[PDB]
């Protein structure tokens, strides 16, 4: 549903000078953003 | 004539 349009952009925090950010978790990794395929209402039930 | 009713539980 339209929820995927409401989802906010992936805007991450940057470290200030003189320190670093917490070590990135190995989980919740994003796959290569190749952009392949249809989005939203362009998707339908898949044929066999 | 009629005694219409219904029930919906939470």
């Amino acid at each position: 549903d339209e929820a995927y349009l409401e989802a906010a952009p992936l805007a991450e925090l940057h470290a200030p000078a003189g320190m670093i950010l917490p070590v990135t978790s190995g989980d919740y990794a994003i796959p290569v953003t190749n952009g392949s395929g249809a989005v939203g209402k362009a998707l339908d039930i898949r044929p066999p | 004539a009629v005694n219409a009713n219904f029930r919906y539980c939470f």
């Binding site: - | 004539a1 009629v2 005694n3 219409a4 009713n5 219904f6 029930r7 919906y8 539980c9 939470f10």
Partner: protein
């Protein structure tokens, strides 16, 4: 079942042992023998032994009776030595008791838990002294390590928001585990009445020896239903009733009740809302607004109230609030049972003339106190409830009065499984007028909530009939066409004093649970009570309405069961002791949304 013999039994006779046996079957004989062991072991017979049985004869060896010689304490005890001593001090020369030894070990296991010792290891090492028939107790007490709680999470919540459940735990994150404290959450969730079941799981954190998680698992129960219907026809007209009740509205933690009905004679509407946690620490607020009326006489009323309250300790709370009600009536059936109050209140209508009116707008203050240690939301087995409430009028109101109502109930179990329980219930109702005036005629107190064997609202003093009534027949005593004198009536009015009590014997229903998987109970009951009129002027009269002793009684069988639509109840009563004006009932069938 045949004769049971015991040989080698010399300190006691046969019955002293047989009274604990389940036979006035072999697979359970050990449980009586272990009982036999405890019988002896708990009496100092440190060498008591079971030697053999035959099928029934039990061949035993009877030893002497041993005393305690002393207790030794050892192990990795991280302080608390005085408290450990308290768990180990005995009276020198007192009788050896194996159960006491186990108890002491368990008490140590419990004691150290509140300090973060989630898993102590304590082992008793009794020593038998045969030269001096005594037992010396050495205990190895390894306190173990300290455990901290890292995360607390819930599973199984589809409707309730977590903001509600985390309000109930007393163990909080970021501190050491009290293994005994976490369990209070089960009682808290049981008191809310929001769940089918609650349980716990204490789990080790794989990343380090000193962290644990606590997991609660619950199953949500349905919290309310909506009921709507209208009786309609071309001859019947329109008869409407509808409303909704939810105890956890969409899981938000608020209680909401909306009800009303409309017909050609009476109108009702009432809305109520309350929040058990206005503040984060448990301050509650809520209130309601209502309207109603009746049309043949005519009587209309409406009003509203708001109540605030808060807990004062782990088991007790206070609430109080303000509100007012407007009351008006006209063309009401004349009644001396009322006239001796209305004229006492300064009203001067024509005697026995229905053509009359009265109306006030009275503001009052209400309050109450509760005590609650009941251990279940639906099928109480222990604890008790005390609900003491009352209200006093606010100066400037037209009706100045006060009244206090007390409602108590107690559950005490009989068996270890709490399948059989003794239940007591009692009601008290007292009040009086202010300023020299009497109590309102509409505050009088029969029905399924009270003595079951009589028709609803039939218990107590009755009205009498006497100027004018313009209905063409129905009572001759109501009108100048047929009335001759003061007449008796069966129309109950209730009264300004009440005392009612009942007793129930709650039993399991294995003959039902064999077929149905839900919670069902049956009970035997007795109930009795009375209502009377304080300051009734009996010197002018007929039965004496001031007599508080005219207690009436009924008894019968009650059934309690839950259904998918909410709780439902039915009981069948048999009245046994009655007075004049008797209006008996026996089949009490209604909604179970009570208690």
């Amino acid at each position: 079942i045949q004769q049971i013999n015991i040989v080698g039994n010399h300190a006691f006779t046969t019955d002293e042992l047989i009274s604990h046996f389940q036979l006035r079957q072999k697979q359970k004989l050990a449980g009586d023998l272990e009982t036999l062991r405890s019988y002896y072991l708990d009496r100092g017979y440190a060498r008591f032994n079971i030697d053999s049985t035959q099928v029934v004869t039990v061949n035993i060896t009877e030893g002497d009776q041993y005393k305690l010689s002393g207790v030794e304490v050892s192990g990795n005890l991280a302080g608390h030595s005085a408290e450990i001593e308290q768990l180990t001090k005995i009276e020198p020369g007192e009788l050896y008791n194996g159960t006491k030894v186990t108890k002491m070990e368990d008490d140590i296991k419990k004691l150290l838990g509140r300090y973060g010792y989630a898993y102590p290891r304590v082992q008793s090492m009794p020593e038998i002294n045969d030269a001096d028939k005594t037992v010396k107790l050495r205990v190895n007490v390894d306190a173990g390590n300290r455990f901290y709680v890292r995360k607390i999470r819930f599973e199984g919540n589809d409707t309730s928001k977590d903001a509600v459940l985390r309000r109930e735990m007393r163990q909080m994150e970021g501190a050491w585990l009290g293994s005994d404290l976490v369990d209070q959450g089960k009682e808290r969730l049981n008191r809310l009445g929001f769940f089918e079941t609650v349980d716990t799981d204490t789990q080790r954190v794989p990343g380090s020896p000193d962290q644990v998680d606590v997991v609660y698992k619950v199953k949500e129960r349905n919290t309310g239903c909506f009921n709507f219907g209208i009786g309609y026809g071309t001859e019947s007209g329109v008869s409407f009733q509808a409303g909704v009740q939810q105890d956890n509205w969409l899981g938000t933690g608020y209680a909401v009740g909306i009800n009303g009905t409309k017909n050609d004679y009476q109108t009702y509407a009432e809305l109520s809302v309350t929040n058990p946690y206005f503040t984060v620490d448990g301050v509650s607020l809520g209130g309601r607004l209502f309207y109603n009326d009746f049309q043949a006489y005519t009587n209309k009323s409406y009003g509203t109230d708001v109540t605030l309250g808060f807990p004062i300790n782990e088991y007790n709370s206070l609430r109080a609030g303000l509100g007012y009600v407007h009351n008006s009536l006209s063309n009401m059936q004349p009644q001396v049972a009322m006239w001796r109050y209305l004229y006492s209140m300064g009203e001067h209508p024509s005697t026995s003339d229905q053509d009359n009116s009265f109306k006030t707008d009275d503001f009052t203050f209400n309050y109450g106190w509760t005590y609650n240690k009941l251990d279940r939301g639906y099928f109480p087995t222990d604890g008790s409830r005390v609900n003491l409430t009352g209200k006093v009028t606010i100066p400037g109101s037209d009706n100045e009065y006060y009244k206090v109502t007390l409602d108590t109930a107690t559950y005490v179990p009989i068996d270890d499984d709490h399948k059989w329980v003794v239940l007591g219930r009692t009601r008290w109702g007292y009040g009086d007028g202010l300023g020299g005036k009497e109590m309102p005629f509409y505050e009088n107190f029969g029905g399924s909530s009270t003595v079951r064997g009589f028709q609803s609202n039939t218990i107590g003093p009755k009205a009498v009939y006497f100027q004018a009534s313009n209905y063409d027949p129905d009572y001759e005593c109501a009108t100048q066409d047929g009335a001759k004198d003061l007449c008796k009536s069966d129309d109950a009015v209730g009264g300004n004093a009440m005392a009612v009590a009942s007793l129930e014997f709650i039993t399991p229903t294995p003959f039902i649970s064999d077929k149905y998987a839900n919670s069902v109970r049956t009970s035997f009951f007795w109930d009795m009570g009375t209502v009377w009129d304080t300051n009734w002027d009996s010197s002018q009269y007929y039965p004496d309405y001031s007599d508080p002793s005219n207690i009436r009684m009924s008894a019968g069988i009650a059934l309690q069961w839950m259904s998918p639509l909410g709780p439902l109840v039915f009981s069948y009563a048999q009245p046994f002791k009655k007075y004049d004006g008797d209006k008996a009932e026996q089949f009490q069938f209604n909604i179970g949304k009570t208690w």
